[PDB]
Design an enzyme around this catalytic site. Structure first.
Site, PDB file in Angstrom:
ATOM      1  N   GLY A 143      72.441  19.754  57.850  1.00 39.60           N
ATOM      2  CA  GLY A 143      73.435  21.023  57.666  1.00 39.60           C
ATOM      3  C   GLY A 143      74.883  20.546  57.972  1.00 39.60           C
ATOM      4  N   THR A 144      75.563  21.488  57.957  1.00 37.61           N
ATOM      5  CA  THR A 144      77.248  21.260  58.364  1.00 37.61           C
ATOM      6  C   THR A 144      77.182  21.304  60.000  1.00 37.61           C
ATOM      7  OG1 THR A 144      77.835  23.467  58.264  1.00 37.61           O
ATOM      8  CG2 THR A 144      78.174  22.093  56.263  1.00 37.61           C
ATOM      9  N   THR A 145      78.459  20.804  60.466  1.00 36.02           N
ATOM     10  CA  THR A 145      78.487  21.006  61.879  1.00 36.02           C
ATOM     11  C   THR A 145      78.852  22.293  62.320  1.00 36.02           C
ATOM     12  OG1 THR A 145      79.250  18.709  61.962  1.00 36.02           O
ATOM     13  CG2 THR A 145      79.059  19.800  63.928  1.00 36.02           C
TER      14      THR A 145
END
Lengths: 241, 250, 111, 244, 240, 243, 195, 231, 235
Positions: F29-31
């Site tokens: 996933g994104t940070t």
């Protein structure tokens, strides 16, 4: 090979899922130990905060179950907190129904029964934890009772749990063979804690700073944990003699 | 969730075997030896307190259990399974008998109830059989003294004397030589101690042996006086000292 | 003891012409001897060229009209935007009312 | 999810057989032999206990023969624990019927009910079947003396003489040879013991390895008596029929 | 509750549990039905591996569902009892609510519906049973004969057979049964039915059962002797 | 083997492989991050601009629970929403019985016990998110992070998703360089920078920064989104440091 | 409904039941048959609350017919009467009890004996040489107590019944529109078509 | 592969294959386009027939006066989800006298789809949806996947060959967003966008389905002769 | 094994795709919609000559204005017919009117994806639902176990379907009379049937606004078969 996935018997009458739950119990790489004084029950456990981004005050495997009962857990924290919440609920319910504080040994039995059920019913998995319950019981005095993923439990004069439980166990056995009594013959809990830390240092062959330990003490009518500074004062007294 | 295991986990194999029951019996075979002997005026049940560590206080682990004032039980196999069965057996003695007839059940019928619980774990959905064999000793007015064995399948049989677990084949042969229909309770205790010594490796004393009897009524253990018909429990656990006294006479 | 019913007064009147129809009602709402409102509409356009009034206990009347308007909405969803005929509306209202046969909507309805 | 561990106890094989029923029947074929014989003046039930010990308390022991009511008894072949579940259910059905109609339950109606319970475990619920075959011996005033058997499929049939458990093929052949319609109970007693004597896997047939029962109108005047034989009485009938 | 989908489609569009139920039917003792001009006869094979059987009390193969309708079957005997009980309950329920006994077709449609339901309900297996259902509608003199099977399909038959070796006895019926002239008496119909079973049975002994159903709840099972006279006369015309 | 085909099965080394596989979805996933400041907490997340057609500012990711708690997560977004819905029910029932808004440590265990429950049975799948959450209660600020196993601890700073390693090191510098602490306003600026730095592991697409905070002094202990001028100022401060 | 009587003589049971059905102000019918055949040799007459009477009787009839088909056997009158009693005893502690009283007249083919059972809505069962429900017994029992013999013929039973009905028609305030009389014996059930 | 037997099983790389297979059913579906300005929002959908004797399967479903959607994938699943949306729009109106925000509708659909991805016995939904609406914050367009991911957009496309329409809209973005107060021009841009996904066949009068909602425009669907104007 | 509600890697439900295979093994059914009525015809396919073929019921009335023909595992259709009849009658009770043919079809199709681990499997039968209502005139729908339904001018299902559908593609036009449609169904059934078509092994039916749903007598169908034979012999 589906007798390996759920809690049914293997052809040698074994429950592999239970055996593997015992193996999960050492995943935190933490050792704990418990001893009894004349008036108190002390439990100590190693504390490891390997990440600097962690708030170290929130890292703990010692639980205040009731006013009188403490619990140290050997195993991963999610299962540990599952057991802690349940033990807290059971202790509170017991007091409501029967009008007196749940004894340490009775809570241990109850949690051991729950664990037994997970070994017999297929839809539930065992919890990967070993639970050491401590108190100063109003009938039995200083008390240590320990539960495991097989649903086994028993009382102890003293005990140890973790990857290096054997070294600590033999060290403790050797002391009690010498003294010939079932406890540490000491007035104050401070000295019983110092004894406990001292014998863990000998048995593991390692030194401790104040942030490397976690300490819980049970006395008549309460269980409490020590702060880093109470532990520092313990360490100082050990070094100065 | 919900328990979605609503199907049997014990089933017949092509050869007619119920695998899970056979495997439960194997777990019992590994268990520490326990035995029972029936005398003319009593019954004795006995086993070894094999302590897991010497830091363990093994008097806090009770292998021989009171079920009713005149009925006791011992096991071989999985200890936790035994502990929960003892809880259920104590309860069913009340719910399905004492709360109906105002008296404790006769030995054979309490055995029947425990047996039924063990049978159901062998057919009901999503469970395994109990990994224990029980020896249940008791007395009641119309059947006198009796001794029963219950197995993981739920089957039960009455015995004059028997043994289960590890060293049972040897212990049963030892018991066949010594048993007769004229034994007095002290004779049966003596024979129990002799039999049990064979299967024990290490320490053999009052602190490592657990022994109980069903014998005479104990008015001293009743806790109250004044009701003539109430004369006390027939179940009694022998002390560490009482066992050691009989180990000099060995 | 709690009385779940009330009486908000009001009078309504419906007349059918040869190629038209009217539904009239007074706009006064009352309890006992007090006036709650001098203008509280009680005859409603329910869609599909149907008008409705449920007179008596206003809470029950508002609930029924609200349920019937909703029934018209779902009749369109379920039957390809077909127009709800007046005879079909009437039968539908019978089932709304009889559904509470043992705890009735305390109203006299006219469409 | 849980499907993975499901044996599916209630499915046909490609030949149209019920796996678990077939395998339960295999289990039953290792149980001690039980025999029932029907005469004009009563019924005999005879059964062999499985390999006994000298320390077994025989006179307080029951493993084969059970009373369902005063007019009906069963002989068991298979899992004893499974049998006791069904036996207690049958005892209750009999009392339900007696309460409802104020008449003792006819033998077949009891047999059909127990057989329907067994059938249900083969069609729905996903549970294993009962590993039990019964011989029913009983009397009612419609058909008189009757013998039935049922097995894990829930199928039942009526018999003049029948065996269940071990060595039924051999036993059935021997019964078919010597059975005659006008035979009496004392003759049937002898036939039953002679048949067990020949089919047993033991070295000899002794009193301590048998359970025995008769249902006779040898109760005084128009009424029926069940007799579960004591160990000494089995010992006497062994001598009297000349087997020991 | 146990919910498992036991009857499911296979990649070739077959439901194997239903098809395996038919295999259980194939194994069962043979059953046959034949309608005359004013009667229906049901014949059943009895497998003769069972002497020392008590025939007074042993469950009979033809079962009265009501006083005017009978049911026979081939397949699992235990399974058949469940369908027979349900059918008997429904027959009384129909009399209670409609104030008329069931038609033969209605009763067939009910039993067939129960069989279908057990082919797409979770946690249950199909009935290993096919049935022949025969009788006369109330106040009607036209004979009725229907067949059901584990899938739940049903249909009407001038004559039909089910169970083991039913391929053979259907062969016989297809060449010997004329639709333009059905067996005009009880005798002719019973004779044609015994003949059809003799293609498959063995001894015409107590291997063959026959039940005759006439209009107006007139139902009777023939005995060993009466069947024996049919068996007798049939073979004496044979040697020719 | 076959131990990894079913949730709640212990492998021979005492592991639950299905939970470990859930962690893979999280790492994909994104940070997202959190920073504990002097009197509050700051949350920030990287939102990948998959296309021009995404309406800017409109697909909000950070979620409020009650009025004093913020939650952000990386992994399967729907799983995170399911967890926050449950958290909202737990908070409501706590406030209903006990009056006071749920304390942050109490709220942490509610999410923890629920996530842990999804490792007990094979009839459910573990959560495919790691969740960073916290806020202000009567004992001060609290920041937590919760994993698919149900495991959680309190943090000084936290990070998850694809750029987690980069963010951690940045977070460690701040802990070392400020033992006395960080102001809420400093923490917003720092949060913007750390997301910009961590976006290297996701450079393919452009991204949109999203920040929120609860501070005793700056928001009165309520969770608020950082918008407009204060957001731009943090974007500018971040752009400078990557240049 | 109103009057139901029964008498057991030497070889048969006779049940007499009134024909009137009254909805408050009007006699709606004067040919109502207040009885159901449960099996070929068992008849049940009934009286009590409207609707419940016929509903209960038809329910019992359906159940006995079901038993008859299942077992290919006729239950004894004693067995049928015990089944009926249990149903009423269960009904009295229901949410809404069946308010129905019955007489069961059957000929037991096994013992070759007529039998008469009286059962009220509580499930109170008694076997009698003669019986009734409601007020019918108050007017008729003194006559039956005098004339009854256990060895009476069927015709003598009918004559004693005529006398009972005549006393009812004299002293009872309500017009019950005569009775339908039915005889239960070894040959089954038949209706006396002039009374 | 060993991990695609049910929705309750992660693969060793943290994937959910049953969900990915559900996504695959959308890809087989006929193309549908969505786009909006600041005053209106438009759906265009290419309908699919079975053969020359058959009808063209409807793609657009009205949820309320101010909201509706188009589908690509399993049509019965669209019926279940649109029914749920109708109920939720309805609940908001009846209980709160409030038109359901398009953004809130998206959140509700996400959560309903999510539950079918985390439990035994269920299956994910096998349909994708484009939801347009006009509420208190103006015109909106949403894209729903049965993974539960819901996204707000100026324009998009789903179904077979949706990539062409999607690229077109990405170039046109600055033009079509400004088509305010001119419904016909917005629809033209929609029909032009969907044309970038046609091959073999072209837009006919029983082929084309258009829906529009906006400032003073209830959600309305155009089929048949009413789309000849745009052909 | 694998779930009953599992998707394949192509995004299809295994069980639905497999039920479609069972339907391909079914006897043929054909429908043709005209402005004068809708015709429904079926192949009976008796398994033996002793089976009384008028007991074969593959065309069925749902209401006066709606008829139904089936193909596949026909025992599965009975609960579907029961539901359709209940839905038609219930709607008339609630609304004092005839239910639309499409609404009825949609109601039947709502049953279809209600299987899992509700019924244990999809239906193994397909339906042709034909009828008339005031809003959309004469209509013919094809209801599948997938829960999808398509409207058709003409349609064939069962084992002879794609041969029959090609035929219908060529022969159907918007001006067909009812008589022409009847002959067309008879002709295409005759084409794809194994056995020789006659009045005892095929069955016709129609639905007209005036007379509602009607199953044809064997005598009436026999005449149409004769008439078909003569028109084919005349070129």
């Amino acid at each position: 090979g589906y007798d390996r996935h759920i809690t049914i018997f293997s052809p040698e009458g074994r429950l592999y899922q239970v055996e593997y739950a015992f193996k999960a119990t050492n995943q935190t790489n933490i050792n704990s130990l418990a001893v009894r004084g004349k008036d108190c029950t002390v439990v100590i456990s190693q504390k490891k905060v390997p990440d600097k981004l962690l708030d170290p005050t929130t890292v703990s495997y010692i639980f205040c179950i009731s006013r009188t009962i403490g619990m140290v857990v050997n195993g991963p924290i999610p299962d540990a907190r599952n057991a802690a919440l349940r033990a807290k609920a059971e202790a509170a319910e017991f007091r409501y129904k029967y009008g007196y504080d749940m004894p340490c040994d009775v809570l241990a039995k109850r949690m051991a029964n729950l664990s037994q059920i997970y070994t017999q019913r297929a839809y539930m998995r065992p919890l990967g934890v070993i639970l050491t319950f401590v108190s100063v019981d109003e009938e039995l005095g200083p008390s240590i009772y320990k539960t495991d993923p097989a649903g086994y439990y028993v009382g102890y004069k003293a005990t140890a749990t973790g990857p290096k439980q054997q070294e600590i166990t033999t060290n403790l056995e050797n002391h009690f063979k010498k003294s010939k009594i079932d406890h540490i013959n000491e007035e104050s809990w401070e000295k019983v804690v110092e004894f406990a830390i001292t014998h863990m240092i000998d048995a593991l062959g390692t030194e401790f700073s104040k942030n490397d330990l976690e300490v819980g003490v049970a006395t008549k009518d309460k269980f409490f944990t020590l702060s880093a500074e109470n532990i520092e004062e313990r360490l100082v007294a050990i070094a100065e003699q | 969730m919900t328990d979605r295991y609503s199907f049997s986990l014990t089933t017949f194999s092509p050869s007619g075997k119920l695998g899970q029951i056979d495997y439960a019996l194997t777990a019992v075979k590994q268990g520490v030896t326990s035995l029972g002997i029936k005398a003319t005026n009593g019954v004795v049940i006995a086993t070894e307190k094999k302590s897991s560590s010497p830091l363990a206080m093994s008097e806090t682990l009770s292998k021989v259990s009171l079920l009713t004032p005149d009925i006791g039980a011992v096991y071989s196999g999985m200890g936790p399974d035994y502990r929960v069965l003892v809880d259920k057996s104590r309860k069913v003695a009340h719910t399905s008998y004492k709360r109906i007839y105002g008296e404790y059940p006769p030995t054979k019928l309490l055995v029947s109830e425990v047996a039924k619980i063990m049978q159901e774990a062998t057919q009901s959905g999503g469970v395994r059989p109990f990994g224990v064999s029980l020896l249940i000793a008791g007395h009641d007015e119309f059947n006198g003294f009796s001794l029963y064995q219950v197995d993981p399948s739920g089957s039960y049989f009455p015995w004059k004397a028997t043994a289960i677990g590890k060293g049972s084949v040897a212990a049963k042969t030892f018991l066949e030589k010594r048993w007769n229909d004229e034994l007095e309770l002290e004779d049966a205790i003596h024979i129990a101690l002799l039999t049990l010594k064979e299967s024990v490796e290490g320490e053999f004393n009052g602190d490592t042996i657990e022994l109980a009897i069903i014998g005479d009524e104990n008015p001293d253990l009743l806790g109250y006086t004044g009701i003539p018909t109430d004369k006390g429990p027939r179940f009694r656990k022998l002390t560490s000292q009482e066992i050691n006294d009989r180990l000099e006479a060995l | 003891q709690f009385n779940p019913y009330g009486d908000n007064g009001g009078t309504i009147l419906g007349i059918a012409g040869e190629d038209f129809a009217v539904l009239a009602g007074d706009t006064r709402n009352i309890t006992d001897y007090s006036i709650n409102s001098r203008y509280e509409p009680k005859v409603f356009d329910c869609g599909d060229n149907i008008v409705m009034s449920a007179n008596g206990f206003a809470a029950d009347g508002d609930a029924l009209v609200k349920r019937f308007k909703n029934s018209v909405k779902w009749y369109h969803f379920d039957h390809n935007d077909k127009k709800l005929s007046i005879n079909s509306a009437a039968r539908n209202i019978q089932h709304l009312l009889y559904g509470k046969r043992f705890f009735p909507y305390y109203v006299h309805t006219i469409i | 999810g849980s499907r993975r561990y499901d044996s599916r106890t209630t499915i046909f094989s490609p030949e149209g057989r019920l796996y678990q029923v077939e395998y339960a029947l295999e289990s039953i074929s290792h149980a001690g032999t039980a025999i029932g014989i029907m005469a004009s003046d009563g019924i005999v039930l005879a059964a062999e206990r499985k390999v006994t010990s000298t320390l077994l308390e025989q006179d307080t022991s029951t493993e084969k023969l059970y009373k369902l009511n005063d007019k009906i008894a069963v002989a068991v072949a298979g899992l004893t624990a499974d049998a006791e579940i069904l036996i207690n259910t049958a005892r209750i059905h009999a009392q339900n019927y007696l309460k409802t109609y104020n008449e003792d339950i006819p033998v077949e109606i009891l047999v059909r009910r127990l057989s329907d319970i067994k059938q249900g475990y083969t069609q729905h619920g996903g549970l294993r079947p009962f590993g039990v075959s019964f011989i029913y011996a009983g009397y009612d005033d419609r058909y008189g003396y009757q013998l039935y058997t049922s097995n894990p499929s829930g199928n039942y049939t009526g018999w003049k003489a029948i065996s269940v458990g071990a060595n039924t093929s051999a036993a059935q052949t021997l019964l078919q040879m010597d059975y005659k319609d006008d035979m009496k109970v004392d003759d049937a007693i002898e036939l039953a013991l002679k048949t067990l004597s020949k089919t047993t896997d033991s070295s000899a047939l002794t009193y301590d390895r048998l359970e025995f029962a008769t249902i006779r109108k040898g109760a005084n005047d128009g009424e029926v008596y069940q007799k579960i034989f004591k160990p000494q009485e089995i010992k006497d009938i062994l001598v009297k029929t000349g087997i020991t | 509750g146990y919910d498992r989908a036991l009857s499911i489609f296979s990649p070739d569009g077959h439901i194997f549990q239903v098809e395996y139920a038919l295999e259980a039917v194939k194994r069962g003792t043979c059953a046959v039905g034949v309608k005359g001009k004013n009667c229906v006869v049901l014949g059943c094979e009895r497998r003769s591996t069972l002497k020392l059987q008590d025939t007074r009390i042993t469950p009979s193969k033809v079962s009265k569902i009501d006083s005017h309708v009978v049911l026979s079957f081939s397949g699992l005997n235990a399974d058949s009892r469940i369908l027979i009980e349900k059918a008997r309950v429904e027959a009384q329920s129909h009399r209670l609510t409609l104030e008329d006994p069931v038609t033969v077709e209605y009763l067939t449609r009910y039993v067939a519906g129960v069989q279908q339901r057990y082919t797409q309900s979770g946690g249950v297996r199909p009935f290993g049973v096919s049935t022949l259902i025969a009788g006369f509608d109330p106040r009607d003199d036209e004979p009725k004969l229907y067949q059901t099977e584990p899938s739940g399909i049903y249909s009407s038959w001038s004559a039909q057979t089910i169970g083991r070796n039913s391929k053979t006895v259907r062969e016989f019926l297809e060449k010997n049964y004329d639709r333009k002239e059905p067996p005009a008496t009880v005798e002719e119909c019973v004779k044609l039915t015994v003949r059809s079973l003799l293609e498959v049975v063995q001894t015409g002994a107590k291997n063959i059962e026959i039940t005759v159903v006439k209009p107006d709840s007139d139902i009777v099972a023939l005995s060993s002797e009466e069947i024996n006279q049919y068996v007798t006369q049939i073979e004496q015309e044979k040697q020719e | 083997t076959g131990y990894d085909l079913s949730n709640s099965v212990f492998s021979p080394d005492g592991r639950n492989f299905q939970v470990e596989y859930a962690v893979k979805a999280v790492e994909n996933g994104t940070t997202s991050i959190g920073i504990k400041c002097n009197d509050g907490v700051v949350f920030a997340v990287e939102k990948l601009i998959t296309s021009k057609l995404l309406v800017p500012q409109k697909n909000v990711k950070i979620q409020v629970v009650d009025r004093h708690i913020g939650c952000v997560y990386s992994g399967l977004i729907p799983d995170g929403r399911h967890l926050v819905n449950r958290g909202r029910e737990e908070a409501a029932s706590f406030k209903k019985l006990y009056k006071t808004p749920i304390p942050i440590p109490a709220f942490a265990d509610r999410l923890g016990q629920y996530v842990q429950a999804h490792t007990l049975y094979n009839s459910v799948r573990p959560f495919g998110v790691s969740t960073i959450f916290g806020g202000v209660d009567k004992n001060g600020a609290h920041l937590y992070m919760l994993e698919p196993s149900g495991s959680y601890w309190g943090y000084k700073g936290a990070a998850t998703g694809k750029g987690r390693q980069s963010a951690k090191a940045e977070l460690e510098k701040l802990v070392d360089h400020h033992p006395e602490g960080l102001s809420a306003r400093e923490a917003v600026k720092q949060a913007a920078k750390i997301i910009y730095l961590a976006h290297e592991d996701n450079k393919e697409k452009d991204f949109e920064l999203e920040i929120s905070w609860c501070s005793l002094s700056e928001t009165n202990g309520l969770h608020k989104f950082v918008k407009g001028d204060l957001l731009q100022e943090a974007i500018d401060f971040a752009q400078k440091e990557i240049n | 409904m109103d009057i139901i009587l029964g008498i057991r003589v030497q070889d048969s049971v006779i049940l007499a039941s009134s024909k009137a059905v009254t909805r408050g102000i009007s006699v709606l019918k004067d040919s109502d048959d207040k009885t159901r055949q449960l099996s070929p040799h068992t008849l049940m007459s009934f009286a009590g609350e409207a609707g419940d009477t016929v509903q209960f009787a038809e329910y019992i009839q359906a159940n006995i017919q079901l038993y008859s088909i299942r077992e290919d056997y006729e239950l004894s009158p004693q067995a049928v009467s015990s089944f009926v009693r249990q149903e009423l005893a269960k009904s009295i502690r229901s949410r809404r009890p069946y308010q129905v009283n019955v007489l069961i007249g059957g000929y037991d083919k096994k013992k070759n004996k007529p039998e008469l059972y009286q059962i009220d809505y509580l499930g109170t069962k008694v076997e009698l040489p003669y019986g009734a429900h409601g007020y019918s017994g108050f007017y008729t029992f003194s006559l039956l107590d005098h004339h009854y013999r256990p060895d009476m013929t069927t015709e003598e039973g009918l004559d004693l019944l005529k006398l009972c009905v005549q006393e009812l028609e004299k002293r009872m305030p309500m017009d019950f529109k005569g009775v339908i009389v039915k005889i239960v014996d070894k040959d089954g059930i038949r209706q006396v078509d002039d009374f | 592969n060993n991990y695609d037997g049910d929705t309750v099983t992660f693969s060793p790389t943290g994937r959910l294959f049953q969900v990915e297979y559900a996504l695959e059913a959308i890809k087989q579906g006929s193309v549908t386009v969505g786009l909006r300005s600041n005053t209106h929002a438009v759906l265009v959908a290419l309908k699919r027939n079975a053969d020359e004797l058959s009808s063209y399967q409807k793609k657009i479903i009205k949820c309320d006066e101010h909201m509706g959607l188009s589908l690509a994938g399993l049509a019965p699943d669209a019926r279940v989800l649109s029914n749920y949306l109708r109920q939720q729009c309805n609940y908001s109106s009846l209980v709160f006298n409030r038109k359901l925000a398009v953004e809130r509708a998206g959140h509700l659909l996400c959560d309903k789809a999510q539950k079918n991805t985390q439990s035994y016995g269920g299956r994910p939904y096998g349909v994708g949806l484009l939801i347009i609406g006009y509420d208190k914050s103006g015109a909106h367009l949403l894209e729903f996947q049965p993974s539960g991911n819901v996204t707000e957009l100026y324009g998009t496309a789903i179904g077979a060959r949706s990539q062409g329409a999607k690229t077109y809209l990405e170039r046109t973005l600055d033009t079509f967003i400004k088509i305010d107060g001119n419904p016909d021009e917005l629809i033209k841009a929609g029909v032009e966008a969907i044309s970038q996904s046609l091959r073999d066949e072209s837009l006919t009068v029983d082929n084309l389905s258009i829906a529009i909602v906006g400032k003073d425009t209830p959600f309305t669907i155009y089929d048949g002769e009413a789309v000849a104007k745009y052909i | 094994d694998r779930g009953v509600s599992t998707f394949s890697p192509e995004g299809r439900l295994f069980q639905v795709e497999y039920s479609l295979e069972a339907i391909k093994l079914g006897s043929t059914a054909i429908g043709i919609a005209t402005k004068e009525g809708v015709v429904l015809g079926v192949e009976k396919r008796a398994t033996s000559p002793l089976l009384e073929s008028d007991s074969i019921e593959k065309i069925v009335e749902i209401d006066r204005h709606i008829g139904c023909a089936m193909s596949g595992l026909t025992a599965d259709a009975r609960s579907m017919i029961e539901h359709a009849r209940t839905a038609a009658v219930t709607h008339n009770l609630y609304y004092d009117e005839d239910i639309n043919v499409e609404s009825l079809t949609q109601s039947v199709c709502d049953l279809a994806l209600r299987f899992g681990e509700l019924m244990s499997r999809p239906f193994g039968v397909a339906l042709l639902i034909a009828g008339h209502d005031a809003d959309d005139g004469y209509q013919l729908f094809h209801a599948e176990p997938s829960g999808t339904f398509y409207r058709y001018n003409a349609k064939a299902i069962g084992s002879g379907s794609e041969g029959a559908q090609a035929e219908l593609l060529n022969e159907w036009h918007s001006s067909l009379t009812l008589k022409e449609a009847e002959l067309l169904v008879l002709k295409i059934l005759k084409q794809v049937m194994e056995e020789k078509l006659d009045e005892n092994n095929a069955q016709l039916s129609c639905i007209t606004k005036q007379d509602g749903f009607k199953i044809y007598d064997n005598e009436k169908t026999a005449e149409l078969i004769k008439e078909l034979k003569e028109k084919e012999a005349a070129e």
